[PDB]
Ligand binder design. Sequence first.
Ligand SMILES: O=P(O)(O)OC[C@H]1O[C@H](n2cnc3ncncc32)[C@H](O)[C@@H]1O
Ligand SMILES: O=P(O)(O)OC[C@H]1O[C@H](n2cnc3ncncc32)[C@H](O)[C@@H]1O
Ligand SMILES: O=C(O)c1cccnc1
Ligand SMILES: O=C(O)c1cccnc1
Lengths: 347, 347
Amino acid sequence: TLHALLRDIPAPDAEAMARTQQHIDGLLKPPGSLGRLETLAVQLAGMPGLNGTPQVGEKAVLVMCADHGVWDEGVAVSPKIVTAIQAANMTRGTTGVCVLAAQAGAKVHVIDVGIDAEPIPGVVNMRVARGCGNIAVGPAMSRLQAEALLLEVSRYTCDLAQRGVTLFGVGELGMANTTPAAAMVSVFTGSDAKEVVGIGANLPPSRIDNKVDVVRRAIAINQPNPRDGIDVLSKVGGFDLVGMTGVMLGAARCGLPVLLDGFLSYSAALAACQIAPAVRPYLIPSHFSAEKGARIALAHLSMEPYLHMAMRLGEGSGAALAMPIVEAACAMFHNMGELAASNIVLP
Amino acid sequence: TLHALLRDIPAPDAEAMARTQQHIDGLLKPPGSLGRLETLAVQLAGMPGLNGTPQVGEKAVLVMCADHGVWDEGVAVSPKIVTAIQAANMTRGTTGVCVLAAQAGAKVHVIDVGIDAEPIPGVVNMRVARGCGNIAVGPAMSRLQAEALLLEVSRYTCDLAQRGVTLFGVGELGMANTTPAAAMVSVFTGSDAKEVVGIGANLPPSRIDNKVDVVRRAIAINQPNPRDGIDVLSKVGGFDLVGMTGVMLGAARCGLPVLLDGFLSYSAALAACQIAPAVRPYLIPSHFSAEKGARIALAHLSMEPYLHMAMRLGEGSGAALAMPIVEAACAMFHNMGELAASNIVLP
Ligand SMILES: O=P(O)(O)OC[C@H]1O[C@H](n2cnc3ncncc32)[C@H](O)[C@@H]1O
Ligand SMILES: O=P(O)(O)OC[C@H]1O[C@H](n2cnc3ncncc32)[C@H](O)[C@@H]1O
Ligand SMILES: O=C(O)c1cccnc1
Ligand SMILES: O=C(O)c1cccnc1
């Protein structure tokens, strides 16, 4: 059951974290001089799946692909078919996340949770339906469908842990998905749609007004409950967004770290933390999306991204780009010399 | 002569940059969606030493080490000997920059431009003197000494280019060096000392007032000319700071990119750009130093760091941490597929 899953998410190991902090303080450098790299190492040390120490074994980026019915409301400029096309390209390694993941030594897992097209060979099949319902006139899916996908994705995720994966990255693919993402952010943060609706994948500025209106309509018609993350996801979210939330719950249950990506991932993280606050300690920010509603989303998650690249591609491209940073924290921890060894004393 | 050197710094190749932009726009993604990663690739494409395309061959981090006479004014908490000790540790690979450089596949070059101690085996010897003069009572060095080191370091730098190095990172080591760095920033930016003097390597807050006073005294007594970068460096700078400036001039003359590090590097970059504006196009920011005067320095250099890690170690540790980002831009450029190949059309 999902209740068991949520109930079994482990709390951070404070004992391992204390030993980490002490060790970092004794390294060949002025105490605290490596700033957020030190904080990151301690965070990792508290994750039970890492065996009491900051370490990175195998790396995987999970890309959840699906189509959205709200695409018919004219909120996206790319043809709907671009989702299926790009999902296929993911298997050929020519996409942005594939190239960056290869650069970071990570494997890309492409999962189809609801693409509106024939099944794509090479893509993991977990499709709920051929595209989710149009949120502007009703819910994206039933609560049952949402919970089922959460469970399936979380199981898939923690199963990879048995294959040596210790670091996850989340990603997505789905034309028009920045619309339900904005709706969710508006609902969870209590912000007006206008403040969190962006241009997504180059939406013309003249078409923004319509996008804001669609978001408002979706909310008014569905009346999602902000205190129920599953309610929000099933009503104004999408299969892809649900899948991303599932990776976060899965990794957390597995006691492992997850790298967030951009705007879509922020909306999924808001939902995950609402569903289970215990997931928070396992989330690691990557970059600061150029999407309008990024600042608001990040503020509610109390997260400060490490990378400011004005990126807005999605796919988990930002998550892959940050993996080297996580490895750097581990390298610092394990490979630096110690002050005592050089007889140096620094207050 | 130094005049020849400065005169021969090549301008960016606009033709190669135009071809770069066109290619990036045709990649398998919404135009401009990779933000600053795209801008970085184009910048690299314009650097003549890279052969008309964003590419990274061998990587090197140059660490300029030297002691400062102003240390006697009580502006630093670490014993003066820590410079020599850490410089030795650089040869053993136990320091922060060594670990991060190894993680990025870069080689660390440790250069002694003025450590106040016996020569250290394994360290490149270019020492001007055993520590520079105390800037609080007079100049750090003579103009002649400054120009000579600039020339020597710039030659060493461009010579590495012949060994396959295509990407440089700058670093330093020198107890009390954030004092002359603050003086230089104050002079070049016209900001008051109080606004740019930080805690350096954990200087107690109760000792900050004295540091501000020392900086003011150095400026009042030396009267450095803001319009003459060499004048400023020789008067209120240090051998290490001069050396960093030399790496920047050298790489620029070689038509190659240089990654800045933190606060000390910002002061050296201000000087380099004053000496020769043509150097600017070759400078690449890495992280946003936690030092107080960082914001002001970066504003005058019109640079926005990619990494926000609250780092303040120095040594070129931030520069090494950003190398993977430069390689990512190259990977994007060369390895992504093209829109035309998938028959996809995106405005
Ligand atoms: O709401 P919007 O405006 O449609 O933007 C969301 C989509 O843009 C991104 N995206 C990611 N890869 C893409 N390849 C082509 N087009 C878009 C792409 C993201 O992954 C989604 O597919
Ligand atoms: O002006 P301040 O307060 O002395 O700070 C500047 C120094 O701190 C950094 N630094 C870099 N490595 C160090 N190892 C030990 N101590 C300091 C260190 C930097 O490289 C300089 O050596
Ligand atoms: O921040 C993102 O991940 C993003 C922003 C716009 C369009 N697609 C993805
Ligand atoms: O920004 C830096 O590089 C820095 C700041 C403080 C002390 N040492 C180095």
